[PDB]
Amino acid sequence: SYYHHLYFQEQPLRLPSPEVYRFVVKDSEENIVFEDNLQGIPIIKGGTVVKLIERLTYHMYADPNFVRTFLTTYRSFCKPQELLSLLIERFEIPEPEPTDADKISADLKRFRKEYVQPVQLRILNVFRHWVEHHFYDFERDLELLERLESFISSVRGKAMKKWVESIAKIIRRKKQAITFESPPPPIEWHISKPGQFETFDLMTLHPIEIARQLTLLESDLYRKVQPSELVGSVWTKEDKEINSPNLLKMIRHTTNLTLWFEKCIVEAENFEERVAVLSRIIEILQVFQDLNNFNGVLEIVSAVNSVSVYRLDHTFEALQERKRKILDEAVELSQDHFKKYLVKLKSINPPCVPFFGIYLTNILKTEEGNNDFLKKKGKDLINFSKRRKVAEITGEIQQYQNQPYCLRIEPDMRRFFENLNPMGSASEKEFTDYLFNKSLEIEPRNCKQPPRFPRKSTFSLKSPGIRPN
Ligand SMILES: C[C@H]1CN(c2nc(Nc3ccc(O)cc3)nc3ccccc23)CCCN1
């Protein structure tokens, strides 16, 4: 009564009624649309969530690319509990009502072999991919895992036991949860010595080791970001702390470090000390560059572009020309929408830390420039092509996440950079206003030379340089 729709048309497969199994409703413009201008598997443009689930577990062929993109992006259109219920509903396939003749027929044998078993195995593959690559869904919702484990314990049949045991094995391993191929260089120390963590500061630590330790820290933060933290702009929305925890740590580290570089410059009231502070920051930038940490490079560029720093003409003119040329070459990476940076990224060799902000910007642009739904007369369809476009960008982020640095962690220095709090008790607005007022104090408008302020420390301003020892 219901049927599934090259050089010969074979007999149609008989299916159960949609009244008892939602997924066999005929495809139409009102429930699924394909990228027909794009090219063996048809590319899904959008559909109802029921049709997306049907195609996620399609009986005719496997679709690994859709499975991957779906499981990365589905939270922007479907809740995890809802997804599990839909997959279970998909699994529990009723057989077509036997005709007066059946009351095993050839049609029913076809149905179990061509439809039921393939769809059920597709679902088990989706479960496997789900727990393998998105197990945080199950850490975040213990009931979701209980439902899944209970369901797979109900799956009968020798043919499916190996899939069930493969899923259970992954769950087992997930619930349970540094070597060097060549010797990392010795940790570098300047004025602050090992263990003296209360004296740690921008000018007392070694500029080489500041850049190394910030690079190890930023590499770790970058590596831990999952693509679903970026989908649907969830890191800016209500539940951001639950849905984007690693992304937020990355963003907040960058905010704090950029403000700290600004603070170090503007609070150096003594002119010669401030020029030495800026010069040291440029040396840290150089080492970031040597390490291919372009996140760190552009954090420093961002800091010197802050108004309170940028307006310090006397400080930039007092820089050695050699320091000026290094700074300005890095600033030019960012110009014309990061043209030169993007050329450099495509050519570098690992390990590296890419500039994270450009991905965030491109995802926000894509989220804003595409509608979540395709508009229909009846129920509007989920715009899946939008999610694919976002997944393309998150796929780029992941290329650089398995690239460890041959550098030794310094635990005290790592804690120092994890605990930076340049704002004190000020709000961001208060702190920004404070920095600008301090800028005005240390280089007043139209001063022909900066006023004299006392030196802040009694140490040499001389850098140890960026040659490793
Ligand atoms: C004279 C500038 C001062 N300045 C900067 N100068 C330079 N380079 C520079 C070239 C020639 C020179 O004689 C001295 C410095 N690089 C920067 C990089 C990041 C932020 C600001 C600046 C800030 C205001 C613009 N006017």
From Swiss-Prot:
<comment type="function">
    <text>Promotes the exchange of Ras-bound GDP by GTP.</text>
</comment>
<feature type="domain" description="N-terminal Ras-GEF">
    <location>
        <begin position="40"/>
        <end position="175"/>
    </location>
</feature>
<feature type="domain" description="Ras-GEF">
    <location>
        <begin position="206"/>
        <end position="445"/>
    </location>
</feature>
<protein>
    <recommendedName>
        <fullName>Son of sevenless homolog 2</fullName>
    </recommendedName>
</protein>
